[PDB]
Amino acid sequence: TSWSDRLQNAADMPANMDKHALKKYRREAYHRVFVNRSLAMEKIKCFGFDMDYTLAVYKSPEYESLGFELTVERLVSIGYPQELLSFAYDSTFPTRGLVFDTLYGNLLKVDAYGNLLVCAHGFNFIRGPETREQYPNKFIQRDDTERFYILNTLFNLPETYLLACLVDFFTNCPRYTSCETGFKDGDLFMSYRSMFQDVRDAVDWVHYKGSLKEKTVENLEKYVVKDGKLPLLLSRMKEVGKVFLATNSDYKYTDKIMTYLFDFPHGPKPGSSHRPWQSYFDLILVDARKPLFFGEGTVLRQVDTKTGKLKIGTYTGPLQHGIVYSGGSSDTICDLLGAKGKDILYIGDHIFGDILKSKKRQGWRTFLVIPELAQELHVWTDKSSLFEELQSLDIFLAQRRIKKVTHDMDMCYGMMGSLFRSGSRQTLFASQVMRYADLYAASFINLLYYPFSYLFRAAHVLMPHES
Amino acid sequence: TSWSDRLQNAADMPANMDKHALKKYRREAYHRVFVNRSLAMEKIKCFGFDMDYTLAVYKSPEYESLGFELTVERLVSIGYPQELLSFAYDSTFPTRGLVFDTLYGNLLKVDAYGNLLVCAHGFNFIRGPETREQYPNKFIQRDDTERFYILNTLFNLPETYLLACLVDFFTNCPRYTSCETGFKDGDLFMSYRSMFQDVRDAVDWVHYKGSLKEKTVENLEKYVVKDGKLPLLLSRMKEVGKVFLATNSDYKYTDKIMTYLFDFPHGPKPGSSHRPWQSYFDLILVDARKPLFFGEGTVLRQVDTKTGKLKIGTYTGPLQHGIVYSGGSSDTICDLLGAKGKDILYIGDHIFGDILKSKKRQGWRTFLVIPELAQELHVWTDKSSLFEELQSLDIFLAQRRIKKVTHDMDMCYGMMGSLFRSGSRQTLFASQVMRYADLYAASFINLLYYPFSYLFRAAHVLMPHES
Ligand SMILES: Nc1ncnc2c1ncn2[C@@H]1O[C@H](CO)[C@@H](O)[C@H]1O
Ligand SMILES: Nc1ncnc2c1ncn2[C@@H]1O[C@H](CO)[C@@H](O)[C@H]1O
Ligand SMILES: Nc1ncnc2c1ncn2[C@@H]1O[C@H](CO)[C@@H](O)[C@H]1O
Ligand SMILES: Nc1ncnc2c1ncn2[C@@H]1O[C@H](CO)[C@@H](O)[C@H]1O
Ligand SMILES: [Mg+2]
Ligand SMILES: [Mg+2]
C-alpha cells in the first residue's frame, strides 16, 4: 500500500456534507488540516492553487517508475553504460527532502541546522565515526548551494534513487577506480558533481523534450489520482471568495491534466451539469516560474487557448472572462483580484517554491500539501510504541538501545526513514513545514470538511524564560 | 532602575561556591541559564567570548547618553541644525531590534515574518488602518536589506532614539516641507535614506575617529560594569577546557577594557595573586570582523603588543605563549585549539554576527547574552497579571479589550515595548533567539552556577500531526 493508494481510496468516497458527518470525518488524522499558526478562514478572500502534486497527485510508484525509466534511457542514450538499463525503481529507498553532496557523492538526511542524521554513499549507510572523515563536525553548510542540492519535491524521488544506484554501480564496477570526488576510467574522470548534473539535465529533458508527458496523458487513469470532490470544494470556495490557479506547467499540459481532474458525468455534485475546468477559476496563470514569480517575476503574457501558444507581446489589458495568463508575478494576482497577501491562501506542495517564498517574500497565507502524510500517519500510529519507548529512553538517560530503537523506528518508513524525523531529531523538511506552512495536510481536499468561518488555532508560543 | 543597575548589583556579590547555595541561586530567573536546545556541558572543550556587551557590559543610560551626545555633536559639526543640541537621550523610548524603514522614515517592530507590530514615525505611533497606506499588507520584506536596517545591538540604542528625534524635528520644524520619502528645504532635499546614512556614519565616526573611546576609558567606573566573579568563571573553564577571546575591537581598546574587568586586588578568588587578563585565555584574537570571520575571514595577522600595531605580513607560525592574533577566521580557532564546532560554546550579544552566523555557517554551540533580560524578567513577573489576562481574553475569543491590555502590558517596558513581544505576538528578535541561541541568559556569569557536567535540557519538539 502506497501513500497514493490511501489518497485514491479517500478520493473514491463521495462527499457527505451533513455537518455532523463532516465534523466526525475531519477528526481522523487522514482527513484533518493541521495548524502551525492560527488562521481565521473567514478572512481569506482568495484561494490559490498549484497543479502538479497539489490538484494532480501522481500515483505511486507507477509515476516515479516511469520517470526513472525514461531518465535512465536518456542517460544511456548520451553514453552512460548499458548496465543502467538493469536498474529498476525501488520505492522503499528514497525519502523526500534529502541533500545530495556533489563533492563526495553522498545522500544526506539533515536537520534544520545542517547536522547529519543519515549519510548513504550508494547503498552503503555510513556510521557516525566514519562520517567524520568527510564531515568533521557532522555538519554541512546549507548556504553552500553550489555544493549541496536539496531534493524537495515528489518529482525528485526518481533521481534520489537514481543517484544512489549510480554511485553504487560505479563504486562496484571494476572498469572504474573510485576517488574521493568521483570515478576514473582510464583517461576519463567523472566527478560526482558532473554525474549529478547529467542526472538533473536528464530529468529536465524527459519532462520537457522527452516522452514523459505524452506517456502520462495517454494513460491518465494509471498515473493520476482523480477525485469527484474537487469541483465541490472549488465551487464552495467561489461562493465565499475568488479562486485562482498559478502553476509552473504550460497551458497545453495544464489543460490536459485539469480536464482529466474534472472528467466526471457531473459538475460540483452528482446530478449537476458538467462544467469546464476553467469555469472554476477567476484567474488562470501558467508558466508561473515560481519562486521568481514571488519577486520580479517575468513579463505578463496572454495564452492563445486555441493553439496553446503565447500571443506576441506583453499583455497590458484587464482581467476578462476566458483570459489565460502566462508568466507575470504574484503582484499580477493581487492587483487583478483586489487582494493583499494575508487575504490569500495559497495551496501547493513545493516547500521552497510555493510556501517558503510566498510567505517570506509576500506575506501570503500558506497551505502545504504533503501527499506522503497519509502513509506517514499510518506508520506513526501503527508503530507509536517504538517512539513512545524512545521518549522514555531519552528521559531515563536523564544509549546504544536509543540507536537500536531509532533505527527500528526509522526502518518502518523506508531505508531513508520518515520525511519528518530520524528518531527524536526533526528533519530540515519538518522544520520548514513548521516555520512556513500555516496549515498542512495529506490533501487540500481536507479543507472541504471545515466550515469557511472556521478558526484554525495554534497555541501561543512562549520563550523559555516566559514559561 | 535600569537593566545595568540589576547587573551591577549582582556583580557586586561575591561567589558562594557551596553546591547547595549555587543550586538555590540559579533557580532565580535572574541567575538562570535558559535552554532552547539541549546542550551537554561535558562535551564542550572550548569556551569562546565576545568582549563588548558580553564581558564588558556598558552602564545604562550613561553609556547610551554619551554615544547619543557625541553622535549629535558630529552631525551638527557636518552641518545639521543647531536644534539637535537640545535633544537628550531618553532610555524610555528605544527597544532593541527595531527596523528602520529608510524609504518612509518609520521605526518598525516586526515579527519573524515581517508583520508589523508597531510603527512610529518620529514620536507619532501609527494605528493599524493608517499603517496600510504605506504597508498595504502590514508587512515588510525582510530580504530587502537595502531598504530596511535592523538595529540589533545595544550600541544601536542611541541611534534608534536619534532617528526618531530627527524625524520628529524635521516634521515639526516650519523651515522644512515633509514629503513621503524625506524633507525639502528650498532647493535641498534630504531623503530619510540619506538622513539614516548620515546617522550611521556619525555613530561609526564617534566610535572610530571621535572621542567616545577616550571618554569611556577615562571614567571606566562610570561606564563599565565590573564583576569579581569573572576570573573565577574563566579559571574554572580553563580547568576543563580551553578559553578564547574573538572580538571585533582592536588590541589597544581590548587591552584597556579587559585590564579594567580584571582590576581587583586578587586573581580568580579573594586571597589569590592577581593575574593579567591575557593569562586567562589560550587564544586571543582581535579585529575579528564578525560575521565575515565565520566565512572566508581576513588575512591572519599578529599584533605587536608593545606598540599595539600589527606586525607587517601574514602570520604563518604556530600558537605560542603570549601571541595575540588579528583577523583570520573561525577556522583559525578550530585549527589552533584542536576543536570542531560542536566542541565550542561561543558566548556573545550580537544575535546576527555572533550567534546566527556561527550557528549557520559553522555549527558552533551558542550562548546569547541579553543584558536587558534582568529588567525584562522583573517586568514579566511584576506584571504577569496583564499577560495572564491577555491569555484568557485570547481564549475567550474562541477584541478592543485585547488591544487595550496589549498596549498597557507593552507600556510597562517602554514606548517600544518588550524586546521579546508585543502582547501575544513574538518579535523577530525573540524568534531568532529561540532558533539560533542554544542557551541564553541575562549574563554569561550565570554559567558559574552550574556544574561543567550539567545537561541543559529542552523538551523534544513535535509537529502538530505527531502530537
Ligand atoms: N528547501 C530549500 N530548497 C532549496 N533551497 C533552499 C531551501 N531552503 C532554503 N533554501 C535556500 O538555501 C540558502 C540557505 O541555506 C538560501 O539561499 C535559501 O533561500
Ligand atoms: N536504511 C538503512 N539501512 C541500514 N542502516 C541504516 C539505514 N539508515 C540508517 N542506518 C544506520 O543506523 C545507524 C543510526 O541509527 C547508522 O549506523 C546508520 O548507518
Ligand atoms: N538580525 C539580523 N540582522 C541583520 N541581518 C539579518 C538578521 N537576520 C537575518 N538577516 C539577513 O537578512 C536577510 C534575510 O532577511 C539575509 O541576508 C539574512 O542574512
Ligand atoms: N509607545 C506608544 N505610545 C502610544 N501608543 C502606542 C505606543 N506603542 C504602541 N502604541 C499604540 O497601541 C496600539 C496597538 O496596541 C496602536 O494604535 C499603537 O499606536
Ligand atoms: Mg506542485
Ligand atoms: Mg558584543
mmCIF file of N, CA and C in Angstrom, chain B residues 7-111:
data_model
loop_
_atom_site.group_PDB
_atom_site.id
_atom_site.type_symbol
_atom_site.label_atom_id
_atom_site.label_comp_id
_atom_site.label_asym_id
_atom_site.label_seq_id
_atom_site.Cartn_x
_atom_site.Cartn_y
_atom_site.Cartn_z
ATOM 1 N N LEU B 7 22.299 44.268 36.893
ATOM 2 C CA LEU B 7 23.527 43.533 36.626
ATOM 3 C C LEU B 7 24.676 43.910 37.569
ATOM 4 N N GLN B 8 24.807 45.198 37.873
ATOM 5 C CA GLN B 8 25.886 45.649 38.754
ATOM 6 C C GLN B 8 25.609 45.202 40.191
ATOM 7 N N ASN B 9 24.344 45.156 40.590
ATOM 8 C CA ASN B 9 24.009 44.676 41.935
ATOM 9 C C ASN B 9 24.430 43.225 42.103
ATOM 10 N N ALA B 10 24.179 42.407 41.079
ATOM 11 C CA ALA B 10 24.605 41.010 41.109
ATOM 12 C C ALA B 10 26.120 40.897 41.015
ATOM 13 N N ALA B 11 26.740 41.774 40.224
ATOM 14 C CA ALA B 11 28.190 41.752 40.036
ATOM 15 C C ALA B 11 28.910 42.020 41.345
ATOM 16 N N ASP B 12 28.272 42.805 42.207
ATOM 17 C CA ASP B 12 28.867 43.213 43.489
ATOM 18 C C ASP B 12 28.914 42.081 44.521
ATOM 19 N N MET B 13 28.113 41.039 44.303
ATOM 20 C CA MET B 13 28.074 39.882 45.208
ATOM 21 C C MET B 13 29.266 38.959 44.936
ATOM 22 N N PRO B 14 29.959 38.506 45.994
ATOM 23 C CA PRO B 14 30.990 37.502 45.763
ATOM 24 C C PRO B 14 30.359 36.129 45.557
ATOM 25 N N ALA B 15 31.104 35.241 44.917
ATOM 26 C CA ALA B 15 30.616 33.906 44.608
ATOM 27 C C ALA B 15 30.559 33.108 45.903
ATOM 28 N N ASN B 16 29.454 32.401 46.121
ATOM 29 C CA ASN B 16 29.371 31.384 47.178
ATOM 30 C C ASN B 16 29.301 30.035 46.486
ATOM 31 N N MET B 17 30.420 29.311 46.471
ATOM 32 C CA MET B 17 30.527 28.108 45.640
ATOM 33 C C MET B 17 30.084 26.835 46.356
ATOM 34 N N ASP B 18 29.484 27.006 47.534
ATOM 35 C CA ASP B 18 28.784 25.906 48.199
ATOM 36 C C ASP B 18 27.752 25.369 47.222
ATOM 37 N N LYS B 19 27.732 24.056 47.014
ATOM 38 C CA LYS B 19 26.907 23.474 45.939
ATOM 39 C C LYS B 19 25.402 23.673 46.136
ATOM 40 N N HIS B 20 24.969 23.721 47.388
ATOM 41 C CA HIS B 20 23.560 23.971 47.683
ATOM 42 C C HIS B 20 23.190 25.440 47.478
ATOM 43 N N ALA B 21 24.099 26.342 47.856
ATOM 44 C CA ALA B 21 23.924 27.756 47.583
ATOM 45 C C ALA B 21 23.814 27.984 46.066
ATOM 46 N N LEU B 22 24.669 27.317 45.298
ATOM 47 C CA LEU B 22 24.676 27.508 43.825
ATOM 48 C C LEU B 22 23.362 27.070 43.191
ATOM 49 N N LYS B 23 22.884 25.899 43.602
ATOM 50 C CA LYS B 23 21.640 25.351 43.080
ATOM 51 C C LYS B 23 20.476 26.278 43.402
ATOM 52 N N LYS B 24 20.442 26.790 44.630
ATOM 53 C CA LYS B 24 19.406 27.734 45.038
ATOM 54 C C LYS B 24 19.470 29.013 44.189
ATOM 55 N N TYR B 25 20.682 29.501 43.944
ATOM 56 C CA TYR B 25 20.869 30.772 43.245
ATOM 57 C C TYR B 25 20.364 30.711 41.790
ATOM 58 N N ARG B 26 20.741 29.649 41.076
ATOM 59 C CA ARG B 26 20.432 29.528 39.642
ATOM 60 C C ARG B 26 18.979 29.220 39.358
ATOM 61 N N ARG B 27 18.199 28.959 40.409
ATOM 62 C CA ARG B 27 16.753 28.815 40.271
ATOM 63 C C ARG B 27 16.064 30.152 40.142
ATOM 64 N N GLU B 28 16.691 31.232 40.621
ATOM 65 C CA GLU B 28 16.129 32.571 40.421
ATOM 66 C C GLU B 28 16.343 32.910 38.962
ATOM 67 N N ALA B 29 15.287 33.392 38.298
ATOM 68 C CA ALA B 29 15.332 33.651 36.853
ATOM 69 C C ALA B 29 16.510 34.537 36.465
ATOM 70 N N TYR B 30 16.828 35.528 37.303
ATOM 71 C CA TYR B 30 17.964 36.455 37.052
ATOM 72 C C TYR B 30 19.317 35.770 36.893
ATOM 73 N N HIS B 31 19.467 34.622 37.533
ATOM 74 C CA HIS B 31 20.729 33.933 37.613
ATOM 75 C C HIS B 31 20.715 32.627 36.861
ATOM 76 N N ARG B 32 19.623 32.394 36.143
ATOM 77 C CA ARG B 32 19.418 31.149 35.406
ATOM 78 C C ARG B 32 20.018 31.215 33.989
ATOM 79 N N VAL B 33 20.388 30.056 33.462
ATOM 80 C CA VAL B 33 20.678 29.896 32.024
ATOM 81 C C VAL B 33 19.455 29.196 31.392
ATOM 82 N N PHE B 34 18.874 29.844 30.388
ATOM 83 C CA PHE B 34 17.704 29.334 29.698
ATOM 84 C C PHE B 34 18.134 28.518 28.474
ATOM 85 N N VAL B 35 17.318 27.526 28.138
ATOM 86 C CA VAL B 35 17.693 26.498 27.187
ATOM 87 C C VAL B 35 16.669 26.392 26.059
ATOM 88 N N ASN B 36 17.143 26.675 24.842
ATOM 89 C CA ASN B 36 16.342 26.430 23.646
ATOM 90 C C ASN B 36 16.567 25.052 23.021
ATOM 91 N N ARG B 37 17.805 24.583 23.057
ATOM 92 C CA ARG B 37 18.159 23.250 22.573
ATOM 93 C C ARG B 37 19.089 22.621 23.587
ATOM 94 N N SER B 38 18.913 21.318 23.834
ATOM 95 C CA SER B 38 19.718 20.653 24.834
ATOM 96 C C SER B 38 21.198 20.772 24.535
ATOM 97 N N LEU B 39 21.991 20.866 25.596
ATOM 98 C CA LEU B 39 23.420 21.027 25.488
ATOM 99 C C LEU B 39 24.064 20.364 26.715
ATOM 100 N N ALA B 40 24.884 19.360 26.438
ATOM 101 C CA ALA B 40 25.632 18.648 27.461
ATOM 102 C C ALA B 40 26.941 19.394 27.641
ATOM 103 N N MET B 41 27.080 20.092 28.767
ATOM 104 C CA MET B 41 28.292 20.882 29.028
ATOM 105 C C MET B 41 29.573 20.056 29.036
ATOM 106 N N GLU B 42 29.463 18.776 29.386
ATOM 107 C CA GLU B 42 30.620 17.895 29.384
ATOM 108 C C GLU B 42 31.300 17.775 28.019
ATOM 109 N N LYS B 43 30.525 17.958 26.956
ATOM 110 C CA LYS B 43 31.046 17.854 25.609
ATOM 111 C C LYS B 43 31.710 19.129 25.105
ATOM 112 N N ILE B 44 31.583 20.227 25.856
ATOM 113 C CA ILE B 44 32.223 21.472 25.439
ATOM 114 C C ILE B 44 33.697 21.441 25.828
ATOM 115 N N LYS B 45 34.560 21.603 24.828
ATOM 116 C CA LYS B 45 36.007 21.601 25.006
ATOM 117 C C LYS B 45 36.592 23.011 24.995
ATOM 118 N N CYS B 46 35.912 23.948 24.345
ATOM 119 C CA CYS B 46 36.396 25.339 24.193
ATOM 120 C C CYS B 46 35.280 26.322 24.480
ATOM 121 N N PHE B 47 35.577 27.318 25.303
ATOM 122 C CA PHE B 47 34.659 28.389 25.612
ATOM 123 C C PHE B 47 35.225 29.653 25.004
ATOM 124 N N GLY B 48 34.456 30.256 24.107
ATOM 125 C CA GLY B 48 34.856 31.488 23.436
ATOM 126 C C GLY B 48 33.961 32.662 23.763
ATOM 127 N N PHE B 49 34.566 33.853 23.785
ATOM 128 C CA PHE B 49 33.883 35.062 24.208
ATOM 129 C C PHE B 49 34.045 36.202 23.238
ATOM 130 N N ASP B 50 32.961 36.932 23.081
ATOM 131 C CA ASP B 50 32.978 38.306 22.609
ATOM 132 C C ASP B 50 33.343 39.225 23.784
ATOM 133 N N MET B 51 33.757 40.460 23.490
ATOM 134 C CA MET B 51 34.042 41.449 24.544
ATOM 135 C C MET B 51 32.861 42.397 24.815
ATOM 136 N N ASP B 52 32.603 43.335 23.906
ATOM 137 C CA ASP B 52 31.653 44.415 24.189
ATOM 138 C C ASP B 52 30.204 43.917 24.311
ATOM 139 N N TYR B 53 29.561 44.292 25.408
ATOM 140 C CA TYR B 53 28.223 43.854 25.792
ATOM 141 C C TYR B 53 28.106 42.363 26.059
ATOM 142 N N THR B 54 29.256 41.713 26.261
ATOM 143 C CA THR B 54 29.315 40.313 26.700
ATOM 144 C C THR B 54 30.132 40.308 27.995
ATOM 145 N N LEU B 55 31.442 40.370 27.884
ATOM 146 C CA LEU B 55 32.325 40.519 29.057
ATOM 147 C C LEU B 55 32.239 41.935 29.642
ATOM 148 N N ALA B 56 32.178 42.932 28.747
ATOM 149 C CA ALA B 56 32.164 44.337 29.132
ATOM 150 C C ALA B 56 30.793 44.913 28.868
ATOM 151 N N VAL B 57 29.944 44.955 29.909
ATOM 152 C CA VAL B 57 28.598 45.473 29.763
ATOM 153 C C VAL B 57 28.628 46.940 30.172
ATOM 154 N N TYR B 58 28.311 47.817 29.230
ATOM 155 C CA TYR B 58 28.303 49.259 29.482
ATOM 156 C C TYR B 58 27.076 49.699 30.263
ATOM 157 N N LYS B 59 27.296 50.563 31.259
ATOM 158 C CA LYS B 59 26.236 51.009 32.148
ATOM 159 C C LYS B 59 25.228 51.901 31.432
ATOM 160 N N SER B 60 23.961 51.724 31.803
ATOM 161 C CA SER B 60 22.820 52.365 31.171
ATOM 162 C C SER B 60 22.092 53.225 32.200
ATOM 163 N N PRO B 61 21.660 54.434 31.810
ATOM 164 C CA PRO B 61 21.738 55.022 30.473
ATOM 165 C C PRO B 61 22.987 55.844 30.192
ATOM 166 N N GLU B 62 23.978 55.808 31.081
ATOM 167 C CA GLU B 62 25.135 56.687 30.938
ATOM 168 C C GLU B 62 25.856 56.488 29.611
ATOM 169 N N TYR B 63 26.076 55.230 29.219
ATOM 170 C CA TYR B 63 26.886 54.985 28.020
ATOM 171 C C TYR B 63 26.095 55.333 26.759
ATOM 172 N N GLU B 64 24.821 54.949 26.710
ATOM 173 C CA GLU B 64 23.973 55.340 25.582
ATOM 174 C C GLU B 64 23.921 56.861 25.448
ATOM 175 N N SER B 65 23.825 57.559 26.582
ATOM 176 C CA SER B 65 23.697 59.015 26.548
ATOM 177 C C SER B 65 24.970 59.679 26.023
ATOM 178 N N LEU B 66 26.121 59.137 26.408
ATOM 179 C CA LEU B 66 27.402 59.608 25.890
ATOM 180 C C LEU B 66 27.469 59.383 24.381
ATOM 181 N N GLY B 67 27.106 58.182 23.929
ATOM 182 C CA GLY B 67 27.095 57.929 22.488
ATOM 183 C C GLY B 67 26.188 58.866 21.728
ATOM 184 N N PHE B 68 24.991 59.058 22.261
ATOM 185 C CA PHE B 68 23.982 59.956 21.698
ATOM 186 C C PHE B 68 24.540 61.374 21.577
ATOM 187 N N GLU B 69 25.094 61.869 22.689
ATOM 188 C CA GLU B 69 25.596 63.241 22.727
ATOM 189 C C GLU B 69 26.675 63.452 21.695
ATOM 190 N N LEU B 70 27.629 62.527 21.626
ATOM 191 C CA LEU B 70 28.742 62.670 20.668
ATOM 192 C C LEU B 70 28.263 62.548 19.217
ATOM 193 N N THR B 71 27.295 61.666 18.966
ATOM 194 C CA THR B 71 26.752 61.496 17.628
ATOM 195 C C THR B 71 26.040 62.762 17.173
ATOM 196 N N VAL B 72 25.237 63.369 18.054
ATOM 197 C CA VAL B 72 24.576 64.623 17.746
ATOM 198 C C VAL B 72 25.618 65.707 17.465
ATOM 199 N N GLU B 73 26.657 65.751 18.276
ATOM 200 C CA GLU B 73 27.705 66.769 18.072
ATOM 201 C C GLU B 73 28.379 66.612 16.722
ATOM 202 N N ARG B 74 28.583 65.367 16.300
ATOM 203 C CA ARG B 74 29.195 65.093 14.981
ATOM 204 C C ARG B 74 28.245 65.541 13.856
ATOM 205 N N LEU B 75 26.966 65.226 13.983
ATOM 206 C CA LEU B 75 26.017 65.655 12.973
ATOM 207 C C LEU B 75 25.971 67.188 12.862
ATOM 208 N N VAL B 76 25.931 67.880 13.997
ATOM 209 C CA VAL B 76 25.943 69.346 13.961
ATOM 210 C C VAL B 76 27.244 69.874 13.318
ATOM 211 N N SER B 77 28.364 69.226 13.597
ATOM 212 C CA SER B 77 29.643 69.671 13.038
ATOM 213 C C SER B 77 29.741 69.470 11.522
ATOM 214 N N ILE B 78 28.946 68.561 10.959
ATOM 215 C CA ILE B 78 28.886 68.430 9.492
ATOM 216 C C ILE B 78 27.762 69.258 8.875
ATOM 217 N N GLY B 79 26.974 69.961 9.691
ATOM 218 C CA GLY B 79 26.024 70.909 9.172
ATOM 219 C C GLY B 79 24.568 70.715 9.493
ATOM 220 N N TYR B 80 24.235 69.710 10.312
ATOM 221 C CA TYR B 80 22.860 69.580 10.774
ATOM 222 C C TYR B 80 22.497 70.775 11.666
ATOM 223 N N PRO B 81 21.196 71.085 11.758
ATOM 224 C CA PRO B 81 20.734 72.254 12.504
ATOM 225 C C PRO B 81 21.122 72.263 13.987
ATOM 226 N N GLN B 82 21.349 73.456 14.523
ATOM 227 C CA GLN B 82 21.758 73.580 15.915
ATOM 228 C C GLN B 82 20.734 73.046 16.917
ATOM 229 N N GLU B 83 19.458 72.983 16.516
ATOM 230 C CA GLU B 83 18.406 72.457 17.398
ATOM 231 C C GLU B 83 18.686 71.046 17.864
ATOM 232 N N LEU B 84 19.476 70.294 17.098
ATOM 233 C CA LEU B 84 19.872 68.964 17.541
ATOM 234 C C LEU B 84 20.526 68.994 18.924
ATOM 235 N N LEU B 85 21.242 70.071 19.247
ATOM 236 C CA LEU B 85 21.944 70.155 20.530
ATOM 237 C C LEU B 85 20.984 70.197 21.728
ATOM 238 N N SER B 86 19.712 70.459 21.477
ATOM 239 C CA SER B 86 18.692 70.460 22.525
ATOM 240 C C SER B 86 18.133 69.059 22.808
ATOM 241 N N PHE B 87 18.477 68.077 21.964
ATOM 242 C CA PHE B 87 17.995 66.709 22.185
ATOM 243 C C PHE B 87 18.753 66.158 23.406
ATOM 244 N N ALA B 88 18.143 65.215 24.110
ATOM 245 C CA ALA B 88 18.799 64.480 25.196
ATOM 246 C C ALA B 88 18.306 63.040 25.170
ATOM 247 N N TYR B 89 19.220 62.097 25.347
ATOM 248 C CA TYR B 89 18.869 60.690 25.272
ATOM 249 C C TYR B 89 17.755 60.345 26.262
ATOM 250 N N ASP B 90 16.790 59.555 25.799
ATOM 251 C CA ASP B 90 15.662 59.093 26.617
ATOM 252 C C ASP B 90 15.583 57.575 26.558
ATOM 253 N N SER B 91 16.011 56.921 27.628
ATOM 254 C CA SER B 91 16.057 55.476 27.706
ATOM 255 C C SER B 91 14.686 54.822 27.637
ATOM 256 N N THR B 92 13.631 55.598 27.866
ATOM 257 C CA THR B 92 12.291 55.040 27.834
ATOM 258 C C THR B 92 11.713 54.835 26.447
ATOM 259 N N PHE B 93 12.338 55.419 25.422
ATOM 260 C CA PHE B 93 11.832 55.268 24.069
ATOM 261 C C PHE B 93 12.307 53.996 23.353
ATOM 262 N N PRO B 94 13.632 53.814 23.175
ATOM 263 C CA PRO B 94 14.039 52.715 22.294
ATOM 264 C C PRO B 94 13.962 51.352 22.966
ATOM 265 N N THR B 95 13.553 50.362 22.186
ATOM 266 C CA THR B 95 13.749 48.947 22.476
ATOM 267 C C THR B 95 14.668 48.451 21.379
ATOM 268 N N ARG B 96 15.505 47.484 21.706
ATOM 269 C CA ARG B 96 16.462 46.934 20.738
ATOM 270 C C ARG B 96 15.734 46.058 19.709
ATOM 271 N N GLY B 97 16.320 45.958 18.510
ATOM 272 C CA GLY B 97 15.848 45.045 17.459
ATOM 273 C C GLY B 97 14.844 45.665 16.500
ATOM 274 N N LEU B 98 14.609 46.972 16.616
ATOM 275 C CA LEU B 98 13.681 47.648 15.721
ATOM 276 C C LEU B 98 14.281 47.737 14.329
ATOM 277 N N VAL B 99 13.407 47.960 13.355
ATOM 278 C CA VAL B 99 13.792 48.087 11.948
ATOM 279 C C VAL B 99 13.557 49.524 11.507
ATOM 280 N N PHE B 100 14.578 50.183 10.959
ATOM 281 C CA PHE B 100 14.344 51.477 10.366
ATOM 282 C C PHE B 100 14.052 51.277 8.873
ATOM 283 N N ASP B 101 12.905 51.802 8.459
ATOM 284 C CA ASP B 101 12.491 51.791 7.060
ATOM 285 C C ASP B 101 13.035 53.072 6.440
ATOM 286 N N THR B 102 14.102 52.932 5.646
ATOM 287 C CA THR B 102 14.753 54.112 5.042
ATOM 288 C C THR B 102 13.921 54.795 3.968
ATOM 289 N N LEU B 103 12.886 54.121 3.467
ATOM 290 C CA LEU B 103 12.054 54.752 2.455
ATOM 291 C C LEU B 103 11.134 55.799 3.084
ATOM 292 N N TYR B 104 10.404 55.400 4.131
ATOM 293 C CA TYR B 104 9.347 56.230 4.704
ATOM 294 C C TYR B 104 9.684 56.812 6.094
ATOM 295 N N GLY B 105 10.835 56.438 6.651
ATOM 296 C CA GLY B 105 11.334 57.062 7.877
ATOM 297 C C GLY B 105 10.675 56.597 9.147
ATOM 298 N N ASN B 106 10.162 55.388 9.119
ATOM 299 C CA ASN B 106 9.476 54.789 10.261
ATOM 300 C C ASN B 106 10.400 53.827 11.019
ATOM 301 N N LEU B 107 10.232 53.767 12.353
ATOM 302 C CA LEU B 107 10.780 52.688 13.131
ATOM 303 C C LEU B 107 9.686 51.645 13.275
ATOM 304 N N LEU B 108 10.011 50.403 12.953
ATOM 305 C CA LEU B 108 9.069 49.285 12.969
ATOM 306 C C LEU B 108 9.525 48.217 13.959
ATOM 307 N N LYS B 109 8.565 47.686 14.717
ATOM 308 C CA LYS B 109 8.779 46.484 15.489
ATOM 309 C C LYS B 109 8.018 45.408 14.721
ATOM 310 N N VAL B 110 8.716 44.354 14.315
ATOM 311 C CA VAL B 110 8.131 43.320 13.477
ATOM 312 C C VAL B 110 8.301 41.939 14.087
ATOM 313 N N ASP B 111 7.466 41.005 13.609
ATOM 314 C CA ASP B 111 7.643 39.601 13.961
ATOM 315 C C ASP B 111 8.584 38.899 12.963
#
